Protein backbone atom coordinates (compact mmCIF):
# COMPACT_ATOMS: atom_id res chain seq x y z
CA UNK A 1 0.00 0.00 0.00
CA UNK A 2 1.35 3.59 -0.28
CA UNK A 3 1.92 3.76 3.75
CA UNK A 4 4.27 0.47 3.59
CA UNK A 5 7.71 1.18 3.83
CA UNK A 6 8.39 -0.81 0.14
CA UNK A 7 6.32 1.71 -1.76
CA UNK A 8 6.82 4.60 0.02
CA UNK A 9 11.14 3.77 0.03
CA UNK A 10 10.51 3.06 -3.63
CA UNK A 11 8.40 6.14 -4.45
CA UNK A 12 10.81 8.57 -2.95
CA UNK A 13 13.90 6.98 -5.41
CA UNK A 14 11.40 7.76 -8.49
CA UNK A 15 11.16 10.91 -7.25
CA UNK A 16 15.28 12.15 -6.83
CA UNK A 17 15.95 10.55 -10.40
CA UNK A 18 13.47 12.59 -12.11
CA UNK A 19 14.81 15.90 -9.79
CA UNK A 20 18.16 15.88 -9.36
CA UNK A 21 20.42 16.84 -12.18
CA UNK A 22 24.00 16.08 -13.25
CA UNK A 23 24.11 18.75 -15.45
CA UNK A 24 23.28 22.78 -15.83
CA UNK A 25 22.09 22.24 -19.79
CA UNK A 26 19.78 19.94 -21.45
CA UNK A 27 20.43 20.14 -25.03
CA UNK A 28 20.28 16.10 -26.17
CA UNK A 29 18.04 15.33 -24.11
CA UNK A 30 19.55 11.35 -21.84
CA UNK A 31 19.26 9.13 -24.50
CA UNK A 32 2.33 6.36 -11.92
CA UNK A 33 0.28 9.81 -12.66
CA UNK A 34 0.30 10.96 -8.99
CA UNK A 35 4.02 10.39 -9.12
CA UNK A 36 4.06 12.57 -12.42
CA UNK A 37 2.04 15.91 -10.42
CA UNK A 38 5.30 15.65 -7.76
CA UNK A 39 8.10 15.34 -10.09
CA UNK A 40 6.81 18.54 -12.19
CA UNK A 41 5.67 20.28 -8.81
CA UNK A 42 9.17 19.25 -7.85
CA UNK A 43 10.68 20.67 -10.60
CA UNK A 44 8.79 23.51 -10.80
CA UNK A 45 10.11 24.73 -6.66
CA UNK A 46 13.63 23.48 -7.97
CA UNK A 47 13.26 26.63 -10.26
CA UNK A 48 11.56 29.10 -8.08
CA UNK A 49 14.77 28.13 -5.92
CA UNK A 50 17.22 28.18 -8.01
CA UNK A 51 15.90 31.87 -9.36
CA UNK A 52 16.12 32.96 -5.55
CA UNK A 53 19.58 34.51 -5.78
CA UNK A 54 20.14 35.11 -2.09
CA UNK A 55 19.62 31.43 -1.70
CA UNK A 56 21.89 31.24 -4.47
CA UNK A 57 24.84 33.08 -3.09
CA UNK A 58 25.09 30.96 0.53
CA UNK A 59 24.77 27.83 -1.23
CA UNK A 60 27.68 28.17 -3.86
CA UNK A 61 29.40 29.67 -0.26
CA UNK A 62 29.40 25.48 0.96
CA UNK A 63 32.34 23.66 1.44
CA UNK A 64 32.18 20.79 -0.53
CA UNK A 65 35.70 19.41 0.34
CA UNK A 66 34.17 16.35 2.33
CA UNK A 67 30.39 16.04 0.10
CA UNK A 68 29.53 12.92 2.99
CA UNK A 69 30.12 14.72 6.20
CA UNK A 70 28.38 17.79 4.75
CA UNK A 71 25.43 16.22 3.63
CA UNK A 72 24.42 14.02 6.97
CA UNK A 73 25.52 17.25 9.03
CA UNK A 74 22.67 19.37 7.18
CA UNK A 75 20.14 16.57 6.59
CA UNK A 76 20.64 16.05 10.35
CA UNK A 77 20.38 19.78 11.47
CA UNK A 78 17.25 19.89 9.05
CA UNK A 79 15.16 17.63 11.38
CA UNK A 80 16.96 17.44 14.44
CA UNK A 81 14.61 19.60 16.40
CA UNK A 82 11.43 16.79 15.54
CA UNK A 83 9.23 18.95 14.05
CA UNK A 84 9.20 17.40 10.85
CA UNK A 85 7.34 19.03 7.65
CA UNK A 86 7.21 18.51 3.99
CA UNK A 87 9.08 21.59 3.09
CA UNK A 88 12.05 20.76 4.59
CA UNK A 89 11.80 17.29 2.88
CA UNK A 90 11.91 19.71 -0.07
CA UNK A 91 14.42 21.46 0.92
CA UNK A 92 16.23 17.82 1.95
CA UNK A 93 15.41 16.91 -2.08
CA UNK A 94 17.14 20.01 -3.21
CA UNK A 95 19.94 19.95 -0.74
CA UNK A 96 20.79 16.47 -2.38
CA UNK A 97 20.75 18.16 -6.19
CA UNK A 98 23.00 20.94 -5.36
CA UNK A 99 26.07 18.65 -4.08
CA UNK A 100 25.55 16.60 -6.81
CA UNK A 101 26.26 19.61 -8.85
CA UNK A 102 29.23 20.77 -7.03
CA UNK A 103 31.00 17.54 -6.29
CA UNK A 104 33.88 16.26 -8.49
CA UNK A 105 34.10 12.72 -9.50
CA UNK A 106 35.77 11.04 -12.07
CA UNK A 107 32.88 8.98 -12.11
CA UNK A 108 30.09 11.16 -11.43
CA UNK A 109 27.70 8.69 -12.56
CA UNK A 110 28.68 6.83 -9.18
CA UNK A 111 28.70 9.74 -7.11
CA UNK A 112 24.74 10.31 -8.03
CA UNK A 113 23.78 7.05 -6.72
CA UNK A 114 26.13 7.57 -3.81
CA UNK A 115 24.39 10.70 -2.97
CA UNK A 116 20.99 9.33 -4.08
CA UNK A 117 21.82 6.49 -1.28
CA UNK A 118 22.65 9.38 1.33
CA UNK A 119 19.17 10.47 0.93
CA UNK A 120 17.26 7.35 0.77
CA UNK A 121 19.45 6.28 4.10
CA UNK A 122 18.61 9.53 5.73
CA UNK A 123 14.74 9.48 5.01
CA UNK A 124 14.54 5.55 5.83
CA UNK A 125 16.08 5.76 9.10
CA UNK A 126 14.95 9.46 10.01
CA UNK A 127 11.83 10.19 8.29
CA UNK A 128 10.29 6.77 7.21
CA UNK A 129 7.71 6.71 10.44
CA UNK A 130 6.43 10.29 9.90
CA UNK A 131 5.83 10.14 6.12
CA UNK A 132 3.63 7.14 6.88
CA UNK A 133 1.99 9.51 9.49
CA UNK A 134 0.86 11.65 6.37
CA UNK A 135 -0.88 8.96 4.24
CA UNK A 136 2.64 8.19 2.17
CA UNK A 137 3.87 10.48 0.05
CA UNK A 138 0.50 11.87 -1.21
CA UNK A 139 0.96 13.95 2.05
CA UNK A 140 3.76 16.12 -0.41
CA UNK A 141 1.03 16.30 -3.15
CA UNK A 142 -1.47 17.72 -1.01
CA UNK A 143 1.28 20.20 0.76
CA UNK A 144 1.59 21.96 -2.79
CA UNK A 145 -1.98 22.61 -2.96
CA UNK A 146 -2.13 24.78 0.70
CA UNK A 147 -0.20 27.21 -0.59
CA UNK A 148 1.18 29.08 -4.20
CA UNK A 149 4.73 28.41 -5.40
CA UNK A 150 5.50 31.17 -3.86
CA UNK A 151 4.54 30.52 -0.44
CA UNK A 152 6.26 26.90 -0.55
CA UNK A 153 9.83 28.14 -2.60
CA UNK A 154 10.06 31.38 0.20
CA UNK A 155 9.41 28.62 3.22
CA UNK A 156 11.66 25.90 2.04
CA UNK A 157 14.34 28.61 0.88
CA UNK A 158 14.66 29.58 5.01
CA UNK A 159 14.56 25.84 6.11
CA UNK A 160 17.95 25.95 3.73
CA UNK A 161 18.99 28.79 4.96
CA UNK A 162 18.91 28.00 8.47
CA UNK A 163 20.51 25.01 7.87
CA UNK A 164 23.40 26.16 5.41
CA UNK A 165 23.95 29.40 7.84
CA UNK A 166 25.28 27.30 10.64
CA UNK A 167 26.68 24.24 9.00
CA UNK B 1 30.31 39.67 -22.17
CA UNK B 2 31.19 36.00 -22.63
CA UNK B 3 34.08 35.42 -24.40
CA UNK B 4 35.60 31.38 -25.51
CA UNK B 5 39.04 31.99 -26.22
CA UNK B 6 40.79 29.07 -28.11
CA UNK B 7 44.20 27.61 -28.45
CA UNK B 8 46.48 28.33 -31.45
CA UNK B 9 45.91 25.94 -34.65
CA UNK B 10 47.32 22.42 -34.57
CA UNK B 11 49.79 20.25 -37.04
CA UNK B 12 49.91 16.81 -35.92
CA UNK B 13 51.23 13.78 -37.37
CA UNK B 14 48.93 10.87 -37.60
CA UNK B 15 48.57 8.55 -35.06
CA UNK B 16 49.37 10.83 -32.63
CA UNK B 17 47.30 12.89 -29.76
CA UNK B 18 46.28 16.94 -29.09
CA UNK B 19 44.73 18.56 -26.38
CA UNK B 20 42.77 21.82 -27.52
CA UNK B 21 41.76 24.56 -24.53
CA UNK B 22 39.26 26.97 -24.26
CA UNK B 23 39.76 29.26 -21.98
CA UNK B 24 36.38 30.57 -20.58
CA UNK B 25 35.71 34.15 -19.40
CA UNK B 26 32.79 36.64 -18.12
CA UNK B 27 30.40 34.32 -16.55
CA UNK B 28 30.44 31.50 -13.64
CA UNK B 29 32.48 28.70 -15.41
CA UNK B 30 30.85 25.60 -13.29
CA UNK B 31 26.78 27.12 -13.85
CA UNK B 32 27.05 26.29 -18.07
CA UNK B 33 27.43 22.93 -19.68
CA UNK B 34 30.58 23.54 -22.62
CA UNK B 35 29.86 21.31 -25.79
CA UNK B 36 32.42 20.60 -28.78
CA UNK B 37 31.85 20.54 -32.29
CA UNK B 38 33.45 19.36 -35.14
CA UNK B 39 33.42 21.30 -38.67
CA UNK B 40 35.13 19.53 -41.68
CA UNK B 41 34.54 19.56 -45.73
CA UNK B 42 31.63 16.53 -46.29
CA UNK B 43 31.25 15.59 -43.03
CA UNK B 44 29.80 19.08 -41.87
CA UNK B 45 28.66 19.84 -38.19
CA UNK B 46 29.22 17.21 -35.78
CA UNK B 47 28.64 16.90 -32.56
CA UNK B 48 31.21 15.52 -30.20
CA UNK B 49 29.87 16.05 -26.57
CA UNK B 50 29.34 18.50 -23.60
CA UNK B 51 31.01 18.67 -20.13
CA UNK B 52 29.62 20.46 -16.91
CA UNK B 53 32.43 21.77 -15.33
CA UNK B 54 30.29 21.84 -11.88
CA UNK B 55 31.27 18.14 -10.96
CA UNK B 56 32.65 16.60 -14.41
CA UNK B 57 30.39 15.02 -16.14
CA UNK B 58 30.44 14.20 -19.58
CA UNK B 59 28.41 13.15 -22.44
CA UNK B 60 29.73 12.07 -25.89
CA UNK B 61 28.48 10.79 -29.07
CA UNK B 62 29.06 6.99 -29.71
CA UNK B 63 30.79 8.15 -33.07
CA UNK B 64 33.60 9.88 -31.16
CA UNK B 65 34.07 7.61 -28.22
CA UNK B 66 37.90 7.05 -27.72
CA UNK B 67 38.47 9.73 -30.25
CA UNK B 68 37.62 12.78 -27.79
CA UNK B 69 38.09 13.26 -23.96
CA UNK B 70 36.44 16.09 -22.74
CA UNK B 71 38.14 17.72 -19.79
CA UNK B 72 37.68 21.22 -17.40
CA UNK B 73 39.73 22.91 -14.68
CA UNK B 74 37.48 24.88 -12.49
CA UNK B 75 39.77 27.37 -11.39
CA UNK B 76 41.55 28.25 -14.70
CA UNK B 77 37.77 28.28 -16.34
CA UNK B 78 39.20 26.45 -18.97
CA UNK B 79 38.23 23.43 -21.25
CA UNK B 80 40.13 20.60 -23.16
CA UNK B 81 39.26 18.09 -25.17
CA UNK B 82 42.19 15.30 -26.01
CA UNK B 83 41.75 14.00 -29.52
CA UNK B 84 43.30 9.97 -29.89
CA UNK B 85 44.64 8.27 -32.71
CA UNK B 86 45.06 10.85 -35.11
CA UNK B 87 43.97 9.87 -38.62
CA UNK B 88 43.66 12.26 -41.94
CA UNK B 89 39.75 11.79 -41.41
CA UNK B 90 40.75 14.02 -38.02
CA UNK B 91 42.29 17.35 -39.75
CA UNK B 92 39.04 19.60 -39.16
CA UNK B 93 37.86 22.82 -37.35
CA UNK B 94 37.16 22.11 -33.60
CA UNK B 95 34.96 24.57 -31.28
CA UNK B 96 33.93 24.90 -27.76
CA UNK B 97 30.48 26.37 -27.39
CA UNK B 98 28.68 27.39 -24.45
CA UNK B 99 25.00 25.89 -23.72
CA UNK B 100 22.78 28.67 -21.77
CA UNK B 101 20.04 28.51 -19.95
CA UNK B 102 17.21 28.58 -21.36
CA UNK B 103 18.72 28.92 -24.69
CA UNK B 104 21.03 27.02 -26.86
CA UNK B 105 24.35 27.49 -28.12
CA UNK B 106 24.80 31.96 -28.00
CA UNK B 107 28.68 31.95 -27.65
CA UNK B 108 31.43 30.00 -29.40
CA UNK B 109 35.00 29.39 -29.40
CA UNK B 110 36.85 31.16 -32.63
CA UNK B 111 37.47 27.15 -33.62
CA UNK B 112 41.45 25.95 -33.95
CA UNK B 113 42.39 24.42 -37.22
CA UNK B 114 43.76 20.80 -36.83
CA UNK B 115 45.55 19.40 -39.59
CA UNK B 116 46.77 15.72 -39.55
CA UNK B 117 49.04 15.02 -41.91
CA UNK B 118 52.10 12.81 -42.12
CA UNK C 1 20.71 8.91 -34.37
CA UNK C 2 18.59 11.47 -35.57
CA UNK C 3 19.22 12.55 -39.02
CA UNK C 4 18.01 16.05 -40.50
CA UNK C 5 17.29 16.77 -44.29
CA UNK C 6 18.26 20.57 -45.31
CA UNK C 7 16.79 21.78 -48.66
CA UNK C 8 17.42 23.55 -50.60
CA UNK C 9 21.68 22.86 -50.97
CA UNK C 10 21.92 26.40 -52.90
CA UNK C 11 19.28 29.36 -52.11
CA UNK C 12 19.87 32.25 -54.82
CA UNK C 13 18.13 35.68 -53.68
CA UNK C 14 17.90 39.37 -54.40
CA UNK C 15 17.92 41.73 -51.72
CA UNK C 16 14.13 42.67 -50.28
CA UNK C 17 12.96 38.62 -50.92
CA UNK C 18 11.02 36.64 -48.68
CA UNK C 19 13.36 33.50 -48.26
CA UNK C 20 12.76 30.47 -47.06
CA UNK C 21 14.70 27.57 -45.62
CA UNK C 22 13.70 23.83 -44.73
CA UNK C 23 14.26 21.16 -42.57
CA UNK C 24 13.57 17.79 -41.61
CA UNK C 25 13.58 15.33 -39.30
CA UNK C 26 13.69 11.65 -39.37
CA UNK C 27 11.79 11.48 -35.87
CA UNK C 28 9.69 13.77 -34.06
CA UNK C 29 11.95 15.70 -32.34
CA UNK C 30 9.54 18.70 -31.11
CA UNK C 31 10.38 21.91 -30.31
CA UNK C 32 14.25 21.35 -29.75
CA UNK C 33 15.62 22.92 -33.08
CA UNK C 34 17.47 26.05 -33.93
CA UNK C 35 18.89 27.58 -37.08
CA UNK C 36 22.51 29.14 -37.24
CA UNK C 37 23.87 31.93 -39.32
CA UNK C 38 27.72 31.05 -40.66
CA UNK C 39 30.14 33.17 -42.58
CA UNK C 40 33.47 32.42 -44.16
CA UNK C 41 36.07 31.74 -41.40
CA UNK C 42 34.11 32.35 -38.36
CA UNK C 43 31.80 29.86 -35.89
CA UNK C 44 28.01 30.06 -36.41
CA UNK C 45 25.77 31.86 -34.80
CA UNK C 46 22.53 31.51 -33.41
CA UNK C 47 19.95 33.19 -35.16
CA UNK C 48 16.31 31.01 -34.07
CA UNK C 49 16.31 28.38 -30.97
CA UNK C 50 13.39 26.03 -29.55
CA UNK C 51 12.08 26.70 -33.40
CA UNK C 52 10.88 29.85 -33.34
CA UNK C 53 12.84 32.10 -30.45
CA UNK C 54 15.22 34.77 -31.12
CA UNK C 55 17.95 35.23 -29.37
CA UNK C 56 18.64 39.34 -28.49
CA UNK C 57 20.24 41.27 -31.26
CA UNK C 58 19.01 39.53 -33.75
CA UNK C 59 16.78 41.37 -36.29
CA UNK C 60 12.69 40.76 -36.23
CA UNK C 61 13.20 39.69 -40.15
CA UNK C 62 14.35 36.15 -39.05
CA UNK C 63 11.51 34.10 -38.20
CA UNK C 64 11.21 30.17 -37.76
CA UNK C 65 8.33 27.97 -37.64
CA UNK C 66 7.64 24.13 -37.20
CA UNK C 67 5.85 20.97 -36.32
CA UNK C 68 8.11 18.53 -34.95
CA UNK C 69 9.39 17.39 -37.75
CA UNK C 70 9.04 19.61 -40.75
CA UNK C 71 10.78 23.13 -39.90
CA UNK C 72 11.09 26.40 -41.68
CA UNK C 73 13.50 29.49 -40.86
CA UNK C 74 11.58 32.77 -42.81
CA UNK C 75 14.08 36.01 -44.32
CA UNK C 76 11.12 38.84 -44.22
CA UNK C 77 13.44 40.83 -46.75
CA UNK C 78 16.83 39.86 -47.32
CA UNK C 79 19.52 42.06 -46.57
CA UNK C 80 23.03 41.95 -47.63
CA UNK C 81 24.79 40.92 -44.18
CA UNK C 82 22.32 37.41 -44.57
CA UNK C 83 23.91 36.26 -47.19
CA UNK C 84 25.83 33.25 -45.31
CA UNK C 85 25.67 29.92 -45.42
CA UNK C 86 22.62 28.14 -42.79
CA UNK C 87 22.03 25.30 -40.83
CA UNK C 88 19.37 23.54 -38.87
CA UNK C 89 20.12 21.59 -35.60
CA UNK C 90 17.87 19.17 -33.49
CA UNK C 91 19.08 18.82 -29.75
CA UNK C 92 15.81 16.66 -28.89
CA UNK C 93 17.60 13.28 -28.96
CA UNK C 94 21.40 13.67 -29.02
CA UNK C 95 22.61 16.68 -31.13
CA UNK C 96 22.64 16.73 -35.32
CA UNK C 97 23.26 19.47 -37.87
CA UNK C 98 22.02 19.95 -41.05
CA UNK C 99 23.81 19.81 -44.24
CA UNK C 100 23.40 23.36 -44.57
CA UNK C 101 22.10 25.87 -47.05
CA UNK C 102 24.44 28.46 -48.69
CA UNK C 103 22.82 31.57 -49.95
CA UNK C 104 23.73 33.89 -52.92
CA UNK C 105 22.66 36.88 -54.03
CA UNK C 106 21.52 37.32 -58.23
CA UNK C 107 22.52 39.79 -60.41
Known amino acids: GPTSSEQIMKTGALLLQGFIQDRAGRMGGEADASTKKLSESLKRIGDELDSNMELQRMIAAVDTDSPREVFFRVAADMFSDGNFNWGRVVALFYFASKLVLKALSTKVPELIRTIMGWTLDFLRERLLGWIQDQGGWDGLLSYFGTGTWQTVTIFVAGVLTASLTIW | QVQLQQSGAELVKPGSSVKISCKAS????????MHWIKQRPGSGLEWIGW????????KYNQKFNGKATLTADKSSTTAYMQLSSLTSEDSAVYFC???????????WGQGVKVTVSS | DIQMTQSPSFLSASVGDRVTINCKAS??????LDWYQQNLGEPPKLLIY???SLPTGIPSRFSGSGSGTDFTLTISSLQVEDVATYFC????????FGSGTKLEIKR
Open chain 2, 97 to 107: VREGLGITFEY
Open chain 2, 26 to 33: GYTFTNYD
Open chain 2, 51 to 58: IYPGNGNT
Open chain 3, 27 to 32: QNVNKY
Open chain 3, 50 to 52: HTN
Open chain 3, 89 to 96: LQHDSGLT
